[PDB]
Amino acid sequence: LVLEKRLKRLREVLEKRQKDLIVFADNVKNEHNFSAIVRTCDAVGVLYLYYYHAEGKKAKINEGITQGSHKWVFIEKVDNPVQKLLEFKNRGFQIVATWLSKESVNFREVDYTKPTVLVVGNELQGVSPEIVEIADKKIVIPMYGMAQSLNVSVATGIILYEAQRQREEKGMYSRPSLSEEEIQKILKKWAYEDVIK
């Protein structure tokens, strides 16, 4: 019966998932920050998290820091960021990238309620120059101190919660963006993958 409870809870979670709000982690340095980002994705309703990492990208999530959240977000390793992002762009997704530059706009000026792929990272200016070249929006978070930037996980949460606020205002968490077919498919899949190993 206990397992029924988790699936019940999984269903409620899937009914609030934003199949439309995608996150792309561009070369996030340490696993502690990566795990925190996974937790944050889960918190705002992000269902898909893609990532690109040094030497292949064999990312090891910390269960003690993810609290098991790594289980209800699809995490997919990508070998070519621009190629993957172009796939979303051609599908109508706006590519929003954190780019540390005076030419970038305040992150609150973006409309996160439309299909969006938020790209964050630990390259010199946030995302790589290769990625920013294809972005629709280049964003920064206002700073008033000596630090030029914020910890990548903290910045990701700040931006994603602005997205949460906007979507909440439009009632996008009040109705499922995933269809019942998709919800049932995921329930079955994860209930299966959770056991098998």
Secondary structure layout plus pairing:
Elements: H1 2-14, E1 18-26, H2 31-44, E2 46-52, H3 63-66, E3 74-77, H4 81-90, E4 94-98, E5 105-106, E6 116-121, H5 129-132, E7 137-140, H6 152-169, H7 180-195
Helix pairs in contact: 1-7, 2-6
PDB class: transferase
Keywords: methylase, transferase
Assembly: monomeric
Description:
This is tRNA (guanosine(18)-2'-O)-methyltransferase. Pfam families: SpoU_methylas_C, SpoU_methylase. It catalyses: guanosine(18) in tRNA + S-adenosyl-L-methionine = 2'-O-methylguanosine(18) in tRNA + S-adenosyl-L-homocysteine + H(+). Homodimer. The chain is of the alpha/beta class and 197 residues long. The protein has one domain (1-197): Alpha/beta knot. The protein has helices spanning 2-14, 31-44, 63-66, 81-90, 129-132, 152-169, 180-195, and strands at 18-26, 46-52, 74-77, 94-98, 105-106, 116-121, 137-140. It has a seven-stranded parallel beta sheet with strand order 3-2-1-6-4-7-5. Helix 1 crosses helix 7 (180-195) and helix 2 runs parallel beside helix 6 (152-169).
